[PDB]
Amino acid sequence: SMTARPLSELVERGWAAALEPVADQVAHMGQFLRAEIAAGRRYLPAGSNVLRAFTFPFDNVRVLIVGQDPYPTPGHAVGLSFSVAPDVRPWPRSLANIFDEYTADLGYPLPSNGDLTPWAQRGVLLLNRVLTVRPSNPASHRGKGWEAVTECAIRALAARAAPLVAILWGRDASTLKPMLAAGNCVAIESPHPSPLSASRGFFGSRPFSRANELLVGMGAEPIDWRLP
Ligand SMILES: NC1=NC(=O)NC(=O)C1
Ligand SMILES: [Cl-]
What we know:
Layout: H1 7-10, H2 13-18, H3 23-39, E1 63-67, H4 93-106, H5 117-121, E2 124-128, H6 146-159, E3 164-169, H7 171-174, E4 185-190, H8 207-217
Parallel strand pairs: 1-2, 1-3, 3-4
The protein binds 6-aminopyrimidine-2,4(3H,5H)-dione (6UA) and chloride ion (CL).
PDB class: hydrolase
Keywords: DNA-repair, Excision repair, Conformational selection, Ligand-binding, hydrolase
Assembly: monomeric
C-alpha cells in the first residue's frame, strides 16, 4: 500500500531515491485512492500495480514512453503504460494502433499478444502522466496529484549521467517536455495513438527506429523492440 509503506519497499532502489522529493505526495495519492473507495468509486490499475513502472531499474532506463493515464476497462491496465496481460484479446484500440506503427516502422510481424513486459525488461520505462483512472472514465484522475510524481520521475531521469530518449504520446505527456531540456536527453513528441488522435500524426511517426537512431548517436545501445 502506497499510503502505508515507504518508497524503499514499494519501488526499486534507484527509483526510491529518485522519487524522494515526492515521498509525501505518493503517500497522499494512497490517501486519495482510499477516499475514492470510501466514497464509492473504484480505480485502475489494482493498487499493487499502480507504481509498477518504478519496479524496473531506474539506472537501466534508456527510453521513456509516456502516455496519458491507464486503460479505463477493468482487466486491461497493469501498471505499465499501454500494456495488457498476455491473455487479453481483443487488444484495446490504442494498443492495436501502436502495434500497427510498430510493424510499419520496424517491419516485424504483429506481436502475438499485448504484453509489453519485454520492453520494460530491456530498459523502456512505460509511464503514464497520471497513474490511476476511475473505471470507464478516461482522464478522471487528471489534476489529482499524480502529475507532481511523474514530473519528479522525469526530472530525475533527465539528471542522470546517462543517455535518455523520451517518447511523449499526447498532450498530457507533452507537458513533461520542459523538464526534458537536459543535453543528455532528447524528446520525440507525437499525437497519442488513440483513435481520437492517431491520424493527426501518430501513424507514420516511426518512434521506435527514431529512438534507436537517437540512442546510437549518444553512444548508447539501441532497444531491441522485437516482441514475440
Ligand atoms: N489507453 C491508454 N492510454 C494511455 O495514454 N496509456 C495507457 O496506459 C492506456
Ligand atoms: Cl467506479
